[PDB]
C-alpha cells in the first residue's frame, strides 16, 4: 500500500478475482466509509484508470487459515451476483494483524432500503418489481446451488439493486458454505426473520433449500410491507411460522429435525395465505409463496423451478418494460451449468423470442 497525490491516491498490488493469480497494480481514490460493523469496514472508492466506483470490504484475517468467503467468491461469475474485481492484503488499526481486502462492484441500493421507502410512504412495492427482484434472486440461487454452495444468509439487506436498470446482485458470502451430505453444519447460521424452521430446530444436516425458505420470507415481506416472521428468539419466530402454516405434522417435524418428533405440540389451525396478504395480492404470488414456505425442505421448490413459476410469466412477455421506460435486464441468458439441475425447464425459462 502506497500513498501518492494526483487528491489522495492509494496504490496496491491486488490479485484479480478470476483466472490464475496474476496480481496487477491497482490505483484508486475518493475513499470513504460506506459501512462499518463487527465484520470490519466497507469503503467506497473510485478506480483511477476506469473511474468506476467500487466497494472495498476490509475484514480481519488469520493468515494461518484460508478465507472461506474469498475462496467462494473467486468461483462465482454471474450477472445476479456481485463481482469480485480484485483482492489484496494490508494492515489496519490492529497492530501486527493482516487484513483481507475485497474489491467489489459498487451497487448503490439494496432491496431492503427500497422496500423500506415504500413502507415509510405507506405504499406497496409494485408487483413488477417484486417479480423482477425475486426472479433474479432465484436465478442467482440456481447458480450457487449448482456448485453445491449455500448462501445461508439470504435477506433484503444482502440483495443489491441498481435502480436505473433494476438489476439485482446477491452479496455478502461471509456465511456461505459448500454443503456436503454427511458432513454436518452449524445451525446458528442465517439471520433473524429469514431462518428456515429446520435451522431454528437446531438441525445440522440441512440443505441448500434453507435459502429457498429465506427467499420465500423475502417475497412475503415484499407483498406484506413488513417481515412475515418477526421475533427476537427462535421460539418467537417459530410461533409466527406456526400462526401462519399451522402446527407442523410429526412427519414434517421429522423432515426438519427428528429429535422433536415425540414432543406433543398444541395443534394450531393454519391461517389461509389469502388472508395473510392484502386482498389485492396476485393469486400467483400467493401460490408461489406457499410452494417456497414449506415445512418439509424437499417439498420446497428449487430456485430453477421457482423461476419457471407462473408468477414470472409477465417477465417472459416480449412486450415487457420497466416503469421508467427502458427494457428489462438480461433474464434469459441461461448457461448449461445454470440449467444443470433440470434442463427441460429451458423450454419455459427461455421464451421463443429470446432465442432470436
Amino acid at each position: 500500500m502506497k500513498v501518492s497525490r494526483d487528491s489522495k491516491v492509494t496504490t496496491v498490488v491486488a490479485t484479480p478475482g478470476q483466472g490464475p493469480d496474476r496480481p496487477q497494480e491497482v490505483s484508486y481514490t475518493d475513499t470513504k466509509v460506506i459501512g462499518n460493523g463487527s465484520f470490519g469496514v466497507v469503503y467506497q472508492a473510485k478506480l483511477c484508470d476506469s473511474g468506476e466506483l467500487v466497494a472495498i470490504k476490509k475484514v480481519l484475517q488469520d493468515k494461518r487459515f484460508k478465507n472461506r468467503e474469498l475462496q467462494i467468491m473467486r468461483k462465482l461469475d454471474h450477472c445476479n451476483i456481485v463481482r469480485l474485481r480484485y483482492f489484496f492484503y494490508s494492515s489496519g488499526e490492529k497492530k501486527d494483524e493482516v487484513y483481507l481486502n475485497l474489491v467489489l462492484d459498487y451497487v448503490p441500493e439494496t432491496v431492503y432500503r427500497v422496500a423500506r421507502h415504500y413502507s415509510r410512504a405507506k405504499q406497496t412495492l409494485p408487483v413488477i418489481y417484486v417479480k423482477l427482484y425475486m426472479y433474479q434472486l432465484f436465478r442467482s440461487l440456481a447458480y450457487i446451488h449448482s456448485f453445491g454452495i449455500c448462501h445461508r444468509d439470504i435477506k433484503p439487506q444482502n440483495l443489491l439493486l441498481d435502480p436505473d436498470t433494476a438489476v439485482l446482485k446477491l452479496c455478502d458470502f461471509g456465511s456461505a458454505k459448500q454443503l456436503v451430505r454427511g458432513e454436518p453444519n452449524v445451525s446458528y447460521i442465517c439471520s433473524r426473520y429469514y431462518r428456515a424452521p429446520e435451522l431454528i430446530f437446531g438441525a445440522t444436516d440441512y440443505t441448500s433449500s434453507i435459502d429457498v425458505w429465506s427467499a420465500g420470507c423475502v417475497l412475503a415481506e415484499l407483498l406484506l410491507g413488513q417481515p412475515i416472521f418477526p421475533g427476537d428468539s427462535g421460539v418467537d419466530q417459530l410461533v409466527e411460522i406456526i400462526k401462519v402454516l399451522g402446527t407442523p405434522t410429526r412427519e414434517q417435524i421429522r423432515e426438519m429435525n427428528p429429535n422433536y418428533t415425540e414432543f406433543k405440540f398444541p395443534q394450531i389451525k393454519a391461517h389461509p395465505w389469502t388472508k395473510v396478504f392484502r386482498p389485492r395480492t396476485p393469486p400467483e404470488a400467493i401460490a408461489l409463496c406457499s410452494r417456497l414456505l414449506e415445512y418439509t425442505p424437499t417439498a420446497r421448490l428449487t430456485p430453477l423451478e421457482a423461476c419457471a413459476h407462473s408468477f414470472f410469466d409477465e417477465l417472459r412477455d416480449p412486450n415487457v418494460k420497466l416503469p421508467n421506460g427502458r427494457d428489462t435486464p438480461a433474464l434469459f441468458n441461461f448457461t448449461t451449468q445454470e440449467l444443470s439441475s433440470n434442463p427441460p425447464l429451458a423450454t419455459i425459462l427461455i421464451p421463443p423470442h429470446a432465442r432470436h
Binding site: 445451525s187 446458528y188 437446531g202 427462535g234 421460539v235 410461533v239 406456526i242 405440540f265 394450531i268
Partner: peptide, 21 residues
C-alpha cells in the same frame, strides 16, 4: 443459542398453548 430439544420444546409448547383458540 444451541438449546437441547427438551428445554426448547417446553418453551414452544407453553407459548403455543397461549395463542390457541
Amino acid at each position: 443459542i444451541l438449546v437441547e430439544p427438551q428445554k426448547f420444546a417446553e418453551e414452544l409448547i407453553h407459548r403455543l398453548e397461549a395463542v390457541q383458540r
